């Protein structure tokens, strides 16, 4: 039993809710919240900008130190950093950004990072300003993640479409 509430069950291990991931993190304090990161951990907009804003920019400060030490992430890769006031940990995962011309096949590699964590609160990777089709992202999620994932979808219209079209 866990504290996630109001989710629709899509499969044995994947759940979905129309929710603001920031507000959901603030209420649940999950062990892991996933950020929709880029390779530079520059949290300017989309999910990343919202999560970082909710930490009063502490996520960005920590991220800048991480990059100064380690260099950029790989597209499809991840790193574990603090969850600040939102979660125990933040798993920063880089899905391909279609608006940068990155290979969409890397979306499966990106979701594989979730399997290193038993339970996660997450957004759909590569959705939103990353330019991928969220229906496809949901399909890859379901077909790749084996651990327990609670997906927060900000847009109610998109949420309804994702549910109604789910196979
Ligand atoms: C397509 C993504 C983009 N996105 C946000 O940008 C966002 C998330 C939480 C709070 C916020 N306040 C704000 O102004 O923007 C946000 C959440 C969407 C999703 O994952 O469904």
UniProtKB/Swiss-Prot annotation:
Swiss-Prot/TrEMBL catalytic activity: Thiol-dependent hydrolysis of ester, thioester, amide, peptide and isopeptide bonds formed by the C-terminal Gly of ubiquitin (a 76-residue protein attached to proteins as an intracellular targeting signal)
Impact noted for substituting residue 164 to L: In strain: Gamma/P.1
Macro domain segment(s): 1-167
Its membrane topology: Multi-pass membrane protein
Regulation of activity: Inhibited in vitro by GRL-0617.
Subcellular localization, as worded in the UniProt entry: Host endoplasmic reticulum membrane
Complex and partners: May form homohexamers. Interacts with N protein.
Function (record text): Responsible for the cleavages located at the N-terminus of the replicase polyprotein. Participates together with nsp4 in the assembly of virally-induced cytoplasmic double-membrane vesicles necessary for viral replication. Antagonizes innate immune induction of type I interferon by blocking the phosphorylation, dimerization and subsequent nuclear translocation of host IRF3. Also prevents host NF-kappa-B signaling. In addition, PL-PRO possesses a deubiquitinating/deISGylating activity and processes both 'Lys-48'- and 'Lys-63'-linked polyubiquitin chains from cellular substrates.
Protein's name in the database: Papain-like protease nsp3
Organism of origin: Severe acute respiratory syndrome coronavirus 2 (2019-nCoV)
Residue numbers of the full-length protein present here: 1025 to 1191 of 7096
